[PDB]
Amino acid sequence: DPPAVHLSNGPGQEPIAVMTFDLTKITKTSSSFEVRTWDPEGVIFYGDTNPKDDWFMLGLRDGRPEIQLHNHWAQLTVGAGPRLDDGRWHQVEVKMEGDSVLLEVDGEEVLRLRQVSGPLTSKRHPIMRIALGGLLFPASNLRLPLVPALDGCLRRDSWLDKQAEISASAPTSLRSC
């Protein structure tokens, strides 16, 4: 089996990994991974350039994907797709394509948020953070609060553009599944 990691560490709700990227170097604006869980609710990943007004979250709520986003063009809270809380590995892809954010699950397009973003490259503060398994702000600050901990597993993950990655958090924390 390909190497999987725990999405939560237990008591605390701090992300298990944080990656930071130089925005002027991003050419690939998609992430993809595999996820397995029995948990109906929690954070799979969070991205931001600013935690007060340029941020994105993908989690589960009622076993289904949920996207929360606030940036200059769009502010939204959307559920879409099938229940992923069945203990089977699922393929997920999040892509930004033109002004749209796409969500793919198991090879199918399940959500397309159109006209939600201008070009990254020409963005207002050129550093983007990616956190896995939680937020980089307290849960009460979401548009719609959820309890962040997602007792699940992750593998085959690839975030945005490797060539633009400025830092990656200590991998001393990671816990194998």
Ligand X SMILES: C[C@]12CCC(=O)C[C@@H]1CC[C@@H]1[C@@H]2CC[C@]2(C)[C@@H](O)CC[C@@H]12
Q: Pick out residues in 21-50 that bind Ca ion (CB under 5 A).
A: 39, 41-42
**Which of 60, 150, 160, 164: binder of ligand X (CB under 6 A)?**
160
Residue 156: how many CA atoms within 13 Å on its side-chain side? 12
Closest Cα partner for 16 from 41, 42, 52?
42
Instruction: Give CA–CA dist 160/120, Å, rounded.
Output: 12
Name the minimum Å distance from CB 109 to Ca ion. 26
Instruction: Decide: helix, strand or coil at residue 176.
Output: strand
Residue whose CB is less far from a second copy, 20 or 30: 20
Closest residue (Cβ) to ligand X?
47
SS3 108: strand
Choosing from 5, 15, 64, 146, the residue that interacts with a second copy (CB under 8 A) is 15
| Site residues (vs a second copy, CB under 8 A) | 9, 12, 14-16, 18, 20, 22, 50-52, 125-127, 135-137, 166-173
